[PDB]
Amino acid sequence: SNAGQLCCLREDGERCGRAAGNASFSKRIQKSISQKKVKIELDKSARHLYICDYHKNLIQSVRNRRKRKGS
């Protein structure tokens, strides 16, 4: 019902394949993606806003993982 859907992101034209999780597609995530500059854009043919755990973790853990490397 609320967990039997699929991801609404396309990784290089690939409709993920992994089902949707508890996360939601927001602005912060969009901005996060833009910074990373990758081939991940929202699909407009969809009706819901729910991404998979895979993309959620992948996108969230790029601006929060370490705090020391060179500066």
Region for residue 12 given its phi and psi (left: phi exceeds 0; alpha: psi -120 to 50; beta: otherwise): left
Told to check if 29 binds Zn ion by CB under 5 A, we report: no
Told to check if 20 binds Zn ion by CB under 5 A, we report: no
The residue among 35 and 43 lying less far from Zn ion, judged by its C-beta, is: 43
Contact region with Zn ion (CB under 5 A), list: 10-18, 24-32, 36-44, 58-66: 10-18
Other CB atoms closer than 10 Å to residue 69's CB: what's the count?
5
Residue 3 dihedral angles phi and psi, to the nearest 5°:
-155, 15
Number of residues that bind Zn ion (CB under 5 A): 5
Q: Which of 29, 55, 56, 59 binds Zn ion (CB under 5 A)?
A: 55
Alpha-carbon span 11 to 68, nearest angstrom:
30
Footprint of Zn ion on this chain (CB under 5 A)? 7, 9, 16, 52, 55
